[model samples]
Target: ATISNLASDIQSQVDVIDSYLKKHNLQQPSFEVDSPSELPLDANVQRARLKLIETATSLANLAIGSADHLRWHCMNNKYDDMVLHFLARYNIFDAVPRNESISYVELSQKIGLPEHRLRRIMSMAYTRHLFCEPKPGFVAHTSNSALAINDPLAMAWILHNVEEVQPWYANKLVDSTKKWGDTTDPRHTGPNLNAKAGEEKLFYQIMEEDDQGEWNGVKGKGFRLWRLFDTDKFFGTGGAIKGTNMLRAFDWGKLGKATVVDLSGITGHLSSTVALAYPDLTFIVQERNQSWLEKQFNDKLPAELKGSGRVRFMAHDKYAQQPVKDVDVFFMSTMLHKEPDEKAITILRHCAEAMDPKKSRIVTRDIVLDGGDPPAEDALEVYQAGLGPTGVITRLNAGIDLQMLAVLNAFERTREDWITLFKTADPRFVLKACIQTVGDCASVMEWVLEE
Candidate 1:
């Protein structure tokens, strides 16, 4: 056999073993698979097996040394302030009045920074490739820096991830344990506490809440949900190739006249892609964020979809009453797993109500723990503790969940937990399918509502 085939075979073997361990609740073993014996073995097979072993060894080392692996990320944290300063100085990353490019003079004037100061900051970012230096003394945006201002989702991600989440990392260092709890230390308490209060205040202001409870009643122009490209870099360039491949694998055309209802469909990026691929289909999007919906209606949506009415945007909230009904397919990508169990069920219940009984499917993409084979007994115990009741990861996620817990919390529910939530909300909802995606980083659960 060819080396390629041999490599494929070896890789499959590794995957099968990993899956087996996960399935049977076995502990992950520290064993190595060697190349096939040279005696009577095909040379190509031996070579391929050697390469596979090498690759597996490297991956193992990385996982075992993740603590060190994380150090580089911590080091990069220092430059975050400098990065933010550059972003504000240029006004390069903002949601309003999106521009592909801006001149240095224009940016300086907009930010009210003296031309020289702006130039120096731009120069620094240019050197780091955060911004580009087309020619001496003239600056333009780079993909990395452009995301900070232009992409609403990216902006939110940066602000929350870099500025707000930094304290959590510091806590990790002091505690020396994977698990973290509330600390009286000012560094831990101050920023996190204030950030929560500030965010709650913003949510209350944007979403009017009274004795009736927070829901669609909260009234303010909600922030736009920007499209996030799943790839490594700013512009997808080649980054979206895998996602495209996945879409192709799904054979999306099979669902005849399907309409995907994307809850909280931020900028409608995912919807647009599906609409583009499946011309016969429609995307019915519900978004509570008015500004994002307005942009979709007025600016971002492609002319083809807008003219054809293939994409529909409605102002709706998960906590509020359901808006659109009888969707052929109800879907949420990366959004559902972020909420607490009750909130997730409520959303799913709404989706159940909205889905067409005969043909509709409810799909959610989110994180899940390995459940197939047990790794080691100890490891299984640790995994369960890490993710189980009051577990460290669970607690951390809960603290993080609080930010959205009022509106939408971020918590991963086990398959059993999901079943309970669905039954509690609506008995008609039934699990149709579950799929693993992208090396077990996430899973998609598809459900159907009984007529």
Candidate 2:
């Protein structure tokens, strides 16, 4: 479509969104601190929102022109990061008043930054609508700034991105990519290269270490940084979003008093949700650290669910031989994506070795890309099939794939890759189903052992 056509299409979607909000009596989208960060809409209206975003983006890109876009894209974009880093580090969101404005001088004093430097950063932030300048040289909270102050999880997400891994992306990622691009070894990834000699550890192991250099006694600094996000929504544990995808992907009720082993199930959160829904099924949650799992389960697992005795916690390593045998289902949610092919195959083979040929099934919920890196001629066909990088789901899948590679030298698998992975793990393993629910980023793949 032409630029004008895209503009008109965006307008139509905006009308739909506005009408939906009005009809539902929901808050309108705005930059005000009290405005809702996200709107509640049905699937149809949600499509309108997505289309609006798509068209608006296209219009903006066309308006900006290609040459200038490349200029900005290639330029060192650390200015925004510098502003955000200091803001989060000093909790600048709390310095600015929610309902009132404060002078840049006063804000600088509060946050311990020089007035001139703070003003520079604040001006950059204004361009992004992070904070608003209601009066000359004064700052007030916008919805974006106020959000971090109000929601600790949102702030954690900001801090984690800005502080933990952003530096490595600029510094060592390219070097590691060049040296280890063809290898599947996790220890040779970007983050591993950045760690100190004594702490030359894997991503998870590094995350387990505290800020004071203590290792593994408690949920440490890096671990908290990673976990501090909106876990339920982001990880799809028990959120209203894709938490029900697992339920919709398969018939859990048909198992009839089956045993479900949740491999490396951190807190038994996911398993407990399923157990609550299907009371006949029992779940054994295996984590490498039973103490950590037990603590989280005790703290977070509801009393009735705990009292039911259906969900239990144990310690087990994925690389090791499986102890729990012949279970009806072996569920691995968001686990294997962190490991490269050989490690993942080892995990799968262990599960297959323990599973019953007649009854047991292996279930994995992960980001399964709809297409692989096809050759030039076939690449267009993949995009034409509606699995292109332009779509939100595909972009998210692509982003996660890069992240997996950055941290662990792993990747999100395509459907073809999944088939190959399973066959390589054990020739007798049959992929019974590969299912993805509407709006869910991950697919649920079920495998059965065939003798």
Candidate 3:
């Protein structure tokens, strides 16, 4: 009856179709080889297959529209109220609403939105049951939207999916890849890197281009955040250990006394979590973005952290060759894999140098190439499509390494190749621990500088 319900109902049908196609080894029908010649004018089997294809296409469109609606709410900062109504109609938002209903004015006040503006936005989001107005001027929470708010991971995933893919799509629109590759003169050898020149170059270019391009309005904020957040799964769940797991991996005893130096720490989320879990320790977040750093300094951090002196923010560029001295532990996550080997090693070496040399350790959470054996076909296919397997694994070896290639070419690595590179970079940095969190999507590699 409602748009949300309609979306969900259609989604269920889509799922059924997906299951059927997968069972028949036709999940990606577009990729299937087909006969060029037209079949006999009236074959029943052919007609059925055609019908199935049409159904699949229609369902796929519905799903895309549903997804796009949700994405629009996220980008516009509509939050869960809109997302839930849609989820509820589909039975995805499993919770029941409370008996008491709240008016639009009240809800807007609670969320700090202007009443008229909130109503207008909600109307747009309501097209898909992201929210509902059971009666004029009144609104109610639905289970679906509530889940988005309550479940941190789910909320993060929704936002991340939208934000991360934007740049990739934008690049495609203007053939950015071809342009980046072609512009570099073939003979220019001094740092004449193409599109994939490791993290520093990538970030630098992203920042520089925006000051001259359309993104000049946002001033590269979106891209900057995207760069860091894009790697969340890789360092978080994508890596061996989920990001939370790595945070917990630190020896609590040592961490209790350890002073964590977070490089490029945005909003101090990671460090703040660490401080909360281990109240005895201190955290210093070094970030280059001044506005974000100031917000944390003035508004974002809570009273407890401020009072306890456990959290502090400083504006510093991670790429700058500044000496970080006497740190008990240096913590960085998710940013390393984007860099070339030399740059990655240089970062580690810098962290090592910053340490006190007595008991200090460099705790890095990143993706490493898996090399012992080839991955299963399905997993390998996904990896190649998303991260490009050559650099992450094959290139770890001497003859034709793919790890650097992936970095230089905007590719990804396998686990084994990561190990090879780490060893090659520094024999002292031994794998202290590795864990695979969130399926085989990613594994975490913990290395401790050897004595």
Q: For this target, which candidate reaches the highest lDDT against the unseen true structure?
A: 2
Off by over 4 Å in 2: 15-27, 34-41, 74-77, 93-119, 134-152, 191-200, 210-234, 237-244, 275-280, 290-293, 302-310, 371-387
lDDT of 1: 0.50
Candidate 3 yields a Cα-based lDDT of 0.48
Clashes of each: 25, 0, 32
Q: Please give the lDDT score at residue 329 for candidate 1.
A: 78
- Between candidates 1 and 3, the lDDT winner: 1
What candidate 3 gets wrong by more than 4 Å, as runs, is: 1-142, 147-174, 180-243, 356-358, 368-411, 438-444
State the lDDT of candidate 1 residue by residue for 1-451, as single tens digits: 3445545655875665555557656555321112111111122222333344544544544554768766865666456556764564345555112334556676667777777877766655655556665666555555455535544434444544443345434333334222224322222332233354334332223222223222112223332112121111121122211223225324468787876777735555566767887898878777665433454454557677776778877677866666666667776765765555666777877776666678787766544444212112212124432244433334444544443332222345566776677777788878765553222233456677775
* Span of ten consecutive residues with least summed lDDT in model 1: 31-40
Ranked candidates (TM-score, high to low): 2, 1, 3
Q: Tell me the tens digit of each residue's lDDT in model 2 across 110-205.
A: 989999988888888888889989989899999878877744445555555675556654356788878657676767766666567666666666
User: Which residue pairs of candidate 2 clash?
Assistant: none
TM-score of 1: 0.54
Task: TM-score for candidate 2, please give it.
Answer: 0.80
